[PDB]
Design a binder for this molecule. Sequence first.
Ligand code: MG
Ligand code: MG
Ligand code: MG
Ligand code: MG
Ligand code: MG
Ligand code: MG
Ligand code: MG
Ligand code: MG
Ligand code: MG
Ligand code: MG
Ligand code: MG
Ligand code: MG
Ligand code: MG
Ligand code: MG
Ligand code: MG
Ligand code: MG
Ligand code: MG
Ligand code: MG
Ligand code: MG
Ligand code: MG
Ligand code: MG
Ligand code: MG
Ligand code: MG
Ligand code: MG
Ligand code: MG
Ligand code: MG
Ligand code: MG
Ligand code: MG
Ligand code: MG
Ligand code: MG
Ligand code: MG
Ligand code: MG
Ligand code: MG
Ligand code: MG
Ligand code: MG
Ligand code: MG
Ligand code: MG
Ligand code: MG
Ligand code: MG
Ligand code: MG
Ligand code: MG
Ligand code: MG
Ligand code: MG
Ligand code: MG
Ligand code: MG
Ligand code: MG
Ligand code: MG
Ligand code: MG
Ligand code: MG
Ligand code: MG
Ligand code: MG
Ligand code: MG
Ligand code: MG
Ligand code: MG
Ligand code: MG
Ligand code: MG
Ligand code: MG
Ligand code: MG
Ligand code: MG
Ligand code: MG
Ligand code: MG
Ligand code: MG
Ligand code: MG
Ligand code: MG
Ligand code: MG
Ligand code: MG
Ligand code: MG
Ligand code: MG
Ligand code: MG
Ligand code: MG
Ligand code: MG
Ligand code: MG
Ligand code: MG
Ligand code: MG
Ligand code: MG
Ligand code: MG
Ligand code: MG
Ligand code: MG
Ligand code: MG
Ligand code: MG
Ligand code: MG
Ligand code: MG
Ligand code: MG
Ligand code: MG
Ligand code: MG
Lengths: 93, 271, 46
Amino acid sequence: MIREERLLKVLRAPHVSEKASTAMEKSNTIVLKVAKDATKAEIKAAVQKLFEVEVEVVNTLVVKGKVKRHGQRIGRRSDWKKAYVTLKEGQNL
Amino acid sequence: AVVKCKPTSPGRRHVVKVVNPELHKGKPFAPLLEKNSKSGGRNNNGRITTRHIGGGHKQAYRIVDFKRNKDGIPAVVERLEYDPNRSANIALVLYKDGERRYILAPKGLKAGDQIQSGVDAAIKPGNTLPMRNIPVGSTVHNVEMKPGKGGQLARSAGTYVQIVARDGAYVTLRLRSGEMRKVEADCRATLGEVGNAEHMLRVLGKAGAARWRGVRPTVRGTAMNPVDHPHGGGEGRNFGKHPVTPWGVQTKGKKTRSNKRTDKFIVRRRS
Amino acid sequence: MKRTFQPSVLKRNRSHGFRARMATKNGRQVLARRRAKGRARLTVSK
RNA sequence: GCUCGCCGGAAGACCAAGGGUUCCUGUCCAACGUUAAUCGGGGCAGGGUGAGUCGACCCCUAAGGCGAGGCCGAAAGGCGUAGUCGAUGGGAAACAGGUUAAUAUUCCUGUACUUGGUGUUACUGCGAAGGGGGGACGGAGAAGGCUAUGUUGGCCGGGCGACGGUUGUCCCGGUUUAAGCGUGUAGGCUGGUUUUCCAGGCAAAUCCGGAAAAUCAAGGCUGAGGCGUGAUGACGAGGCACUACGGUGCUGAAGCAACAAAUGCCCUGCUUCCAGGAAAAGCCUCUAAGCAUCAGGUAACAUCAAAUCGUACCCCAAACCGACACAGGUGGUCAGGUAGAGAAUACCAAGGCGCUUGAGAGAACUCGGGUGAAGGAACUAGGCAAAAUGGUGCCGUAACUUCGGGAGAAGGCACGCUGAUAUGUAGGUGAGGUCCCUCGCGGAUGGAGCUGAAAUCAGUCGAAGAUACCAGCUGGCUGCAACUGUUUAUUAAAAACACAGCACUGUGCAAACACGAAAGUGGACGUAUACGGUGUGACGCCUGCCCGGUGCCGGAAGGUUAAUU
RNA sequence: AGGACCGAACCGACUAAUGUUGAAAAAUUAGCGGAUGACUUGUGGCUGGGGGUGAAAGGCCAAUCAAACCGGGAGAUAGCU
Ligand SMILES: [Mg+2]
Ligand SMILES: [Mg+2]
Ligand SMILES: [Mg+2]
Ligand SMILES: [Mg+2]
Ligand SMILES: [Mg+2]
Ligand SMILES: [Mg+2]
Ligand SMILES: [Mg+2]
Ligand SMILES: [Mg+2]
Ligand SMILES: [Mg+2]
Ligand SMILES: [Mg+2]
Ligand SMILES: [Mg+2]
Ligand SMILES: [Mg+2]
Ligand SMILES: [Mg+2]
Ligand SMILES: [Mg+2]
Ligand SMILES: [Mg+2]
Ligand SMILES: [Mg+2]
Ligand SMILES: [Mg+2]
Ligand SMILES: [Mg+2]
Ligand SMILES: [Mg+2]
Ligand SMILES: [Mg+2]
Ligand SMILES: [Mg+2]
Ligand SMILES: [Mg+2]
Ligand SMILES: [Mg+2]
Ligand SMILES: [Mg+2]
Ligand SMILES: [Mg+2]
Ligand SMILES: [Mg+2]
Ligand SMILES: [Mg+2]
Ligand SMILES: [Mg+2]
Ligand SMILES: [Mg+2]
Ligand SMILES: [Mg+2]
Ligand SMILES: [Mg+2]
Ligand SMILES: [Mg+2]
Ligand SMILES: [Mg+2]
Ligand SMILES: [Mg+2]
Ligand SMILES: [Mg+2]
Ligand SMILES: [Mg+2]
Ligand SMILES: [Mg+2]
Ligand SMILES: [Mg+2]
Ligand SMILES: [Mg+2]
Ligand SMILES: [Mg+2]
Ligand SMILES: [Mg+2]
Ligand SMILES: [Mg+2]
Ligand SMILES: [Mg+2]
Ligand SMILES: [Mg+2]
Ligand SMILES: [Mg+2]
Ligand SMILES: [Mg+2]
Ligand SMILES: [Mg+2]
Ligand SMILES: [Mg+2]
Ligand SMILES: [Mg+2]
Ligand SMILES: [Mg+2]
Ligand SMILES: [Mg+2]
Ligand SMILES: [Mg+2]
Ligand SMILES: [Mg+2]
Ligand SMILES: [Mg+2]
Ligand SMILES: [Mg+2]
Ligand SMILES: [Mg+2]
Ligand SMILES: [Mg+2]
Ligand SMILES: [Mg+2]
Ligand SMILES: [Mg+2]
Ligand SMILES: [Mg+2]
Ligand SMILES: [Mg+2]
Ligand SMILES: [Mg+2]
Ligand SMILES: [Mg+2]
Ligand SMILES: [Mg+2]
Ligand SMILES: [Mg+2]
Ligand SMILES: [Mg+2]
Ligand SMILES: [Mg+2]
Ligand SMILES: [Mg+2]
Ligand SMILES: [Mg+2]
Ligand SMILES: [Mg+2]
Ligand SMILES: [Mg+2]
Ligand SMILES: [Mg+2]
Ligand SMILES: [Mg+2]
Ligand SMILES: [Mg+2]
Ligand SMILES: [Mg+2]
Ligand SMILES: [Mg+2]
Ligand SMILES: [Mg+2]
Ligand SMILES: [Mg+2]
Ligand SMILES: [Mg+2]
Ligand SMILES: [Mg+2]
Ligand SMILES: [Mg+2]
Ligand SMILES: [Mg+2]
Ligand SMILES: [Mg+2]
Ligand SMILES: [Mg+2]
Ligand SMILES: [Mg+2]
């Protein structure tokens, strides 16, 4: 069992893009930004307990931050984790 | 035997090889093998401490029994084998209890012969006895220096040692070098000469043959610069020096033995 | 032609990294010198 | 968009290393781009990397590193035992099709596989830090059986031609399908089986090793490919309908055979040679202590789990190493057609490019080429450079020789195309059919079809038939070095270095010798047929005299002579 | 069979021309040598400065070598410019 506050912390935000939309309307997959150290099991438990849906598999990838210029000053955005959460073809969050 | 190659190429013109049809043609006995990687003449500091060493063919070590202390159990010679680690041949023998061992092959030892070690073994080649039980005048090899330590003298191909006298607790040997030495009468020896006595008739024939054996080229001191060798330097070919080693020690006739610990055992130097 | 710098991250780390420095008192002195100077990058690791 | 040109064993495609957002889309042209720029690897914004099976991680070790105690060292530290790390090596498992602007063996569809944990059921001796087997190993060569792949034919769809001809022996295109599962074939290796006993495997062992009988004489191991299935599926030339000119939806014919054939597979095979060719774990197996109708083991079924990190893009390059968008450097994989011996070379396919300044003109001179009257080395330090030779088959080939060579010596002849021999031969492959049977991935016969040199004879065109590309100049005398190699990275490749061979000399093993204040280590897990040093330098004939000087070796009667007393 | 022969990849570097503020701080073009071996190459490791390594040229040790580079003694000393 994974604790309630761990579940309430692992999820960060839904990811909005054309690929995310296409996944939602075609393969019943939602795309989320999750905690950088969240495991697949933690993501599955969290989405099941916080969205009231059934999940069969989670796919995760780490996105690397973009090096940027802000007035000839070297910056870098933070790496984050993105999760591809597949729902059980009847859930429709 | 000893066969000359035919001069089908300059690198073959002068090759003379020693070929033994009796040597086993298959793989060696796996239980008696170990790894032994090469050093390149380098020590644990990583420095070349012996020059002219490197490369060569990969070799595996054959655990040869130099002690011959399985007393009273006869053994039969299974086959003769090639040992890359020495100049002599090794015979794989089998004991009556089912144990297999590698031994140095004496002259005349063919497959199927019986060998036995112990105080009561017969006086025939391949048998290991204490030298107090070996008669004087006998020709032995694989001679021990300290009882139970293992044979150390006369282990190269064609070599042997003669027992010239026995006075009390010591026997007097004549080593291959011509040196007369005393050793304790309780040390063991194997009767007969070491086999492969034609090993010295081989001719490598080319530089690659020596490179195969892990030997690297020798640069003459006189071909160097003075910063490199005591013999270096010159305009043209100049020597004008007394020959020395790369470290300045005279190298033609100057003796280097200094062991007062073992001086007592040397009856007469090799001359 | 073949220049002198042939990059290799493994060799770079094994010969100039933080742990290679810390393995010896001379390397630790190197680290102390760089910290005293205030270097923003102590080693090749970062 | 249509033409033209270039590469095509690359200038195509995919990786590793390295780089790190350069990837895709929208937008902008200040600076950067050796010019302009609407364009960009530039600026700005947004998007994009999906794994139980790929890789890392992980288990296991090499070289080597670190190293509890330990040994050693003024200190710092050095070495090293037990250990513990360390791949460039060993260790379980996934394929085909589809899809995005950008990912895919990761997503979707279909069909699979591996390991482990639980839970039942049945049966049962389980157990290791120990034993044994295995893993597990070189070079070269040769052949057979295959496949990738290609060609042709058959089949299907389409065509009937901008200029003479083209309903045919004509033209164009397609003719594809995996892992897995079942079978067990060409080949390779091996005698099995049952007893009894034993100084061996640190103890034990039913395991391994050894010994003695009996018995059977065929049993086992391994193994590419094919065949069946996977697959009534997918894909598929096209056709039909459209946004909207990018591409969307539906349907979908044939989908066979023969021949040729790898450097890939059988093959970690086989033969042979000497220079004699990793380790450890996973794996199989044996028991010890121990547990003992519990555990634990085996099998069947069900269920659960397989985490974490990488995944974009470049990758012989404009993204890596060279300060540059630099004629340089950079490991592996793939390997189409025609001709050819070929991965050379020429022209092409797939695919990718025209090298980020152009437009004119047609002076000297410079660079890179083509041709050249007569002569032909007269040039020059020197035939430097250029010119020339150049293939295959056959004929023929000197001195000298270490009998191998010299030798591709030198020199010469033939060479295209057509026809016949023979409507395609010798040879290779080999269907149907027939027969046999220890009946099938079988044997015998049989020759259909396919493929196919080389030669002779006759004819024939051109100035020329090895027509292009490609592709030895040859001979004579002589110095030096025997030879193959190595060398002054970046003015010297040689006659210098090395070398096999020779000789002298040291070294008796705790070796001499070398690196180390030392402990240690190398020599060497070697033992005088070995190891070190020095000189000479294949081979043939040889290697003469001098020990006064210097050095070394031996001697020790005498002279001289230190610390010490 | 072979440190055998001819010859691509690959390794090298004998000649000539170009270039010499280069396309390049050592290259290009045409030829050239080896090309189963004393061969070549990837990855990792070891040897450290009076030291290493060197088939030996005083060669090489990060475009630096008859004694590397960096920091320090250090503002060495300079009857010389
Ligand atoms: Mg992942
Ligand atoms: Mg030597
Ligand atoms: Mg020599
Ligand atoms: Mg010299
Ligand atoms: Mg030196
Ligand atoms: Mg000197
Ligand atoms: Mg002279
Ligand atoms: Mg003189
Ligand atoms: Mg990377
Ligand atoms: Mg950027
Ligand atoms: Mg782009
Ligand atoms: Mg754009
Ligand atoms: Mg501009
Ligand atoms: Mg403008
Ligand atoms: Mg951009
Ligand atoms: Mg999945
Ligand atoms: Mg794997
Ligand atoms: Mg180790
Ligand atoms: Mg240590
Ligand atoms: Mg300690
Ligand atoms: Mg380990
Ligand atoms: Mg690896
Ligand atoms: Mg692996
Ligand atoms: Mg892509
Ligand atoms: Mg084992
Ligand atoms: Mg191996
Ligand atoms: Mg082989
Ligand atoms: Mg085929
Ligand atoms: Mg096929
Ligand atoms: Mg038709
Ligand atoms: Mg017409
Ligand atoms: Mg056709
Ligand atoms: Mg047995
Ligand atoms: Mg099939
Ligand atoms: Mg090959
Ligand atoms: Mg990719
Ligand atoms: Mg390319
Ligand atoms: Mg450019
Ligand atoms: Mg470039
Ligand atoms: Mg290359
Ligand atoms: Mg071709
Ligand atoms: Mg040709
Ligand atoms: Mg080509
Ligand atoms: Mg072309
Ligand atoms: Mg094309
Ligand atoms: Mg002109
Ligand atoms: Mg000109
Ligand atoms: Mg001309
Ligand atoms: Mg003329
Ligand atoms: Mg003329
Ligand atoms: Mg003439
Ligand atoms: Mg002339
Ligand atoms: Mg003249
Ligand atoms: Mg003149
Ligand atoms: Mg002249
Ligand atoms: Mg010339
Ligand atoms: Mg020419
Ligand atoms: Mg000719
Ligand atoms: Mg001649
Ligand atoms: Mg000829
Ligand atoms: Mg025929
Ligand atoms: Mg065939
Ligand atoms: Mg003469
Ligand atoms: Mg002369
Ligand atoms: Mg020579
Ligand atoms: Mg040469
Ligand atoms: Mg060179
Ligand atoms: Mg030079
Ligand atoms: Mg020692
Ligand atoms: Mg000489
Ligand atoms: Mg004298
Ligand atoms: Mg004296
Ligand atoms: Mg050769
Ligand atoms: Mg040169
Ligand atoms: Mg060239
Ligand atoms: Mg060449
Ligand atoms: Mg040659
Ligand atoms: Mg050649
Ligand atoms: Mg210093
Ligand atoms: Mg000189
Ligand atoms: Mg340099
Ligand atoms: Mg100095
Ligand atoms: Mg001072
Ligand atoms: Mg200073
Ligand atoms: Mg000053």
